């Protein structure tokens, strides 16, 4: 028996072999009954959204926009003060982005049905970082780790605002 | 390698949990139509068709009994836990006559918190009609901590019974010879179970319930009453209430049992403080029952040259009119589980009905006679359980006749001779049923039409043509004269229902002489007629379960089959199951009439309030005597009149009873769709629905089929019973809680 590298008292999970964040961490075996490509796509998207949202917290409490609506240093209270109209526009824009970036196939059964789709690979690289394949793997691992850390931190900041109410500081 | 058990017969594995229908040879292949799903649950406990060995069936039955007892223990633990945590039992103890027992609080969601009634004692919740508070008080339970510990013990016992079932199916399963030791089983169930349970309960009553309840009746608050264990360690806390414990057990071993007359009395009647039976009388009763049952347990020969053989007893009881007599009955009852189930279920339902009668007749718990909702609910529930169990006993007798009956082994015995003249039995029972129905009901209809025609002197009433139940009144007179004449050591009659004084607790009547007039004559004959018709249906099912003049090979079609075909003019419902279906309907009718008679008679001529000068005013006002003799009277002065509380319960804490009233009406009417219709129409409608699904590519792989004819009948009867019983349940509960 091999046993996992992360959880040393557990057997090595299956389906994670050719990935860019494999430390053998899957005690519940989510990769066995869920497609690993979909799981990586979801992890990357959740991580990127969490990173953007954490940066949004830190900037919102600091900078903010001119106007009476955009005057709440607290993100949770800003979600309510801003009203539904600005939020629904963000929702529709995110939907438009989702549709055009995945080119129609948006669901768990439709995406990766034909393969030829690296999980999380939207081809988005205008600044050109990533031409060298040597640093590409390191960049992918850094993105994954930062995304996970940002998921934890996004939960932390949101719940700090809920239990205190003032801000993050 | 024990001689009674087999070790590790079945492996404890989850593999068969993932293969539904593995028990059945036909269902194991997997579902092809939706009929497979229904067949899966209809054959789950039919262990006879799952194995060909009586040993395996017996082991499955034994483990199923353990599972059932674990379920019962879990239910009891839940009841005690609710009494401990979500009840006003402590408040009810200090004010039994003014606080309504409640042991279930309702969460505040969707406005349902209105169900939390003003039960009293600074409590909000649902009023409890199961009488647990009175039972706990009779047990001497004076604190909610004791209820919590009883709940914990119930949980432990439930786990123990689950473990016992698992152990005796998978680790050590008893052999067939162990199960067939009916002599040993009877000896143990009679001495150990019954007698030693009575003895242990008598000990508990004498040492815990007798002193604690005596202190409670004396006015001592539950907080200053000593803890129950102190009544055992200290022979002076109990010797003050009953000054006979000072002599210890010496009077018992010296045969001077007269010294124990302090706490082993024979009084009769009711406790004037609580309205229940004297707990000293109860303890003496349980002691006598224990001795009698222990003695009765030393009857059958088990392992020594001592006792009786049931085979030799039965085989010696022949006669000129009965041929071989009881020869072969021992083989029938030791090789067929269905025959044992028939006898046990019939006698068990009859026992439940007898219990229901003796409950209200002689209230055995403190402050339970003045809790009218508890009395009504207990009587109705126990009578319903008795009727259901009796129908089940008839059903399993029919099942035994179809499946486990061997013609060769029963040559010219009682079973054979009964089948040989089944025609005579059924024809005479038919004549008796027609006679009883004609008379009882047509006397009711004659009263109704005489009243409708303005001829009040032509009725079958007390102020008219009178049918006095003289035989029952003679018995009532004999019982009220028994103390001092035939029961010379009695101080009071067994029940005040036979006659005597009005017993009131807190201005509320506990018991009172139940007068019998022409109204009781008619309703008693209605009871006899309904019981006779139910017996007719069930006995026709049992006797004609194997063959008939219509179908000479009905036994080859099994116990459960819809018909033999449209031929012979139509052979619907010829099974024996279709007789347990019709008998279920008629049992519902009979029990409904019985509980209606009880409710109206008690409310009109027993229950009520007593004025300080001794004037008795009842709940309804004595309208039973003159208005229960016509069907219009039953419709108006009982159904319409006492349904006022149910229909006016909206917005109050009894609104749940009105909602259940309406829902039970809905379910009862829903049943008639299955009872009146047939399978072909529903199959052909499912055909068009399946066409639509196929048109939308959503037709299931498991082909949807209409419920089988037998399952359609079963669904119809189940819904009918549920709707009717629920309607009566809501009506009774709302009416008797409001007033």
């Amino acid at each position: 028996k091999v046993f996992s590298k992360s959880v040393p008292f557990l057997l090595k999970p299956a389906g994670l072999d050719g990935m860019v964040g494999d430390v053998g961490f899957d005690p519940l075996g989510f990769a066995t009954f869920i497609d690993i490509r979909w799981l990586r796509e979801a992890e990357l998207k959740n991580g990127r959204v969490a990173m953007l949202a954490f940066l949004g917290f830190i900037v919102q409490e600091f900078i903010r926009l001119p106007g009476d609506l955009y005057s709440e240093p607290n993100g949770v209270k800003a979600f309510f003060q801003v009203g539904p109209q600005p939020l629904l526009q963000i929702f529709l824009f995110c939907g438009f982005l989702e549709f055009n970036m995945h080119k129609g196939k948006l669901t768990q059964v439709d995406m990766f049905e034909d393969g030829k789709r690296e999980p999380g690979n939207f081809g988005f690289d205008p600044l050109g970082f990533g031409k060298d394949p040597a640093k590409r793997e390191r960049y992918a691992l850094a993105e994954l780790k930062n995304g996970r850390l940002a998921m934890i931190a996004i939960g932390g900041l949101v719940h700090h605002a809920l239990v205190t109410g003032h801000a993050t500081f | 390698k024990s001689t009674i058990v087999d070790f590790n017969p079945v492996e404890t594995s989850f593999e068969k949990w993932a293969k539904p229908g593995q028990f059945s040879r036909t269902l194991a292949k997997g579902p092809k139509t939706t009929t497979w799903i229904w067949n899966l649950h209809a054959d789950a406990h039919d262990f006879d068709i799952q194995t060909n060995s009586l040993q395996e069936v017996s082991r499955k039955i034994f483990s199923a009994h353990f599972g059932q007892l674990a379920v019962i223990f879990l239910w009891l633990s839940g009841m005690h836990f609710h009494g401990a945590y979500f009840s006003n039992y402590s408040a009810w103890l200090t004010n039994p006559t003014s606080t309504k027992p409640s042991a279930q609080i309702v969460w505040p969601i969707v406005g349902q918190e209105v169900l939390n009634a003003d039960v009293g004692g600074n409590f909000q919740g649902i009023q409890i009609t199961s009488g647990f508070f009175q039972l706990w008080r009779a047990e001497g339970i004076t604190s909610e901590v004791e209820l919590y510990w009883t709940a914990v013990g119930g949980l432990v016992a439930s786990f123990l019974m689950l473990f016992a079932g698992w152990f005796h199916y998978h680790k050590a399963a008893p052999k067939l010879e162990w199960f067939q030791n009916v002599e040993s089983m009877l000896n143990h169930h009679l001495a150990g179970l019954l007698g030693l349970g009575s003895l242990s309960w008598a000990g508990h009553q004498i040492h815990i319930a007798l002193p604690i309840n005596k202190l409670l009746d004396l006015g001592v608050s539950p907080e200053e009453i000593p803890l129950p264990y102190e009544f055992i360690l200290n022979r002076d806390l109990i010797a003050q209430l009953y000054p006979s414990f000072n002599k210890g057990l010496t009077p018992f071993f010296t045969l001077n049992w007269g010294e124990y007359s302090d706490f082993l009395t024979f009084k009769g009647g009711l406790n004037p403080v609580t309205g229940g039976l004297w707990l000293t009388d109860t303890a003496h009763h349980h002691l006598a029952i224990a001795v009698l049952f222990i003695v009765a347990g030393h009857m059958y020969k088990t392992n020594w040259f001592l006792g009786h053989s049931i085979k030799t007893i039965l085989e010696a009881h022949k006669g000129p009119f009965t041929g071989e007599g009881h020869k072969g009955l021992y083989e029938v009852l030791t090789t067929s589980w269905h025959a044992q189930l028939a006898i046990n279920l019939a006698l068990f339902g009859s026992l439940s009905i007898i219990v229901a009668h003796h409950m209200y007749a002689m209230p055995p718990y403190p402050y339970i006679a003045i809790d009218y909702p508890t009395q009504l609910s207990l009587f109705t529930h126990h009578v319903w359980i008795g009727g259901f169990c009796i129908v089940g006993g008839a059903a399993h007798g029919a099942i035994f006749f179809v499946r486990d009956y061997n013609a060769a082994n029963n040559y010219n015995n009682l079973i054979d001779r009964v089948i040989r003249h089944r025609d005579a039995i059924i024809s005479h029972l038919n004549w008796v049923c027609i006679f009883l129905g004609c008379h009882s009901f047509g006397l009711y209809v004659h009263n109704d039409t005489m009243r409708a025609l303005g001829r009040s002197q032509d009725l079958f009433s007390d102020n008219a043509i009178a049918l006095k139940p003289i035989f029952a009144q003679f018995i009532q007179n004999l019982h009220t004269l028994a103390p001092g004449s035939t029961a010379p050591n009695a101080l009071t009659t067994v029940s005040y229902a036979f006659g005597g004084d009005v017993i009131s607790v807190g201005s509320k009547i506990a018991m009172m002489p139940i007068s019998l007039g022409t109204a009781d004559f008619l309703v008693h004959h209605i009871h006899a007629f309904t019981i006779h018709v139910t017996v007719l249906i069930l006995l026709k099912g049992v006797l004609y379960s194997r063959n008939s003049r219509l179908i000479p090979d009905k036994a080859n079609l099994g116990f459960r089959f819809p018909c033999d075909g449209p031929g012979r003019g139509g052979t619907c419902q010829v099974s024996a199951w279709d007789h347990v279906f019709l008998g279920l309907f008629w049992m519902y009718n009979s029990i409904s009439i019985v509980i209606f008679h009880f409710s109206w008679k008690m409310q009109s001529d027993v229950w009520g309030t007593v004025s300080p000068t001794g004037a008795v005013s009842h709940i309804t006002g004595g309208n039973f005597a003159q208005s229960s003799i016509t069907i219009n009277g039953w419709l108006r002065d009982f159904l319409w009149s006492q349904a006022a509380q149910v229909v006016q319960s909206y917005g109050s804490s009894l609104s749940a009873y009105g909602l259940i009233f309406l829902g039970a009406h809905f379910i009862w009417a829903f049943s008639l769709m299955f009872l009146f219709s047939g399978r072909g129409y529903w199959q052909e409608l499912i055909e068009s629905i399946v066409w639509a699904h196929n048109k939308l590519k959503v037709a299931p792989s498991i082909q949807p089929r209409a419920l089988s004819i037998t399952q359609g009948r079963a669904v119809g009867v189940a819904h009918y019973l549920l709707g009717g019983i629920g309607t009566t349940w809501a009506f009774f509960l709302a009416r008797i809680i409001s007033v």
């Binding site: 028996k1 008292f9 557990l10 057997l11 005690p27 519940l28 | 680790k171």
Partner: protein, 168 residues
């Protein structure tokens, strides 16, 4: 035959010699109908939990964390900690650890090779070869059993008599 612990009782027939802390003590034959690895894991879990619990009870009756909520005796600390939510955090993280334990014990029972109670947690070494590991396993088992009995006595005495650290 003739188990070491109870010399007049037969050997439990499931504990020959190949378990740490195996003196053949199973009079009521719990090992005759339950997996040995399952019972070993349960015993080791109880040992560790009760060792931590005894140390915490004794220490918290001496040293208190800053704050008014932490100014109660260990006997009355349960109702205070549950109200403050202190025990909720322990419950959450213990539940996470116990779900991972569900996975681990399932894998151990269905093959794998993980010894009962072996989570491979060993930042320091303290056990370099087989002999040291066996000796330290025996020490852990004996200390855990002693601490289970000690916590039992501590709680029973403290509940009987509401005394401080000397629960006599």
């Amino acid at each position: 035959e003739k188990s070491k612990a109870v010399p007049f009782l037969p050997r439990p027939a499931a504990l020959d010699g190949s378990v740490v802390g195996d003196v053949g003590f199973d009079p009521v034959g719990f090992t005759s109908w339950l997996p040995l690895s399952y019972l070993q894991e349960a015993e080791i879990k109880h040992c560790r939990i009760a060792m931590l619990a005894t140390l915490g009870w004794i220490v918290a009756d001496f040293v208190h964390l800053p704050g008014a909520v932490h100014e109660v005796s260990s006997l009355a600390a349960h109702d205070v900690a549950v109200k403050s939510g202190a025990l909720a955090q322990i419950l959450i993280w213990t539940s996470i650890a116990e779900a991972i334990s569900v996975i681990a014990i399932s894998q151990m029972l269905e093959g794998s090779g993980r010894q009962p109670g072996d989570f491979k947690f060993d930042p320091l070494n303290f056990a370099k070869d087989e002999k040291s590991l066996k000796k330290m396993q025996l020490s852990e088992l004996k200390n855990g059993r002693l601490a289970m009995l000690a916590f039992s006595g501590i709680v029973t005495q403290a509940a009987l008599t509401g005394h401080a650290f000397p629960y006599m």
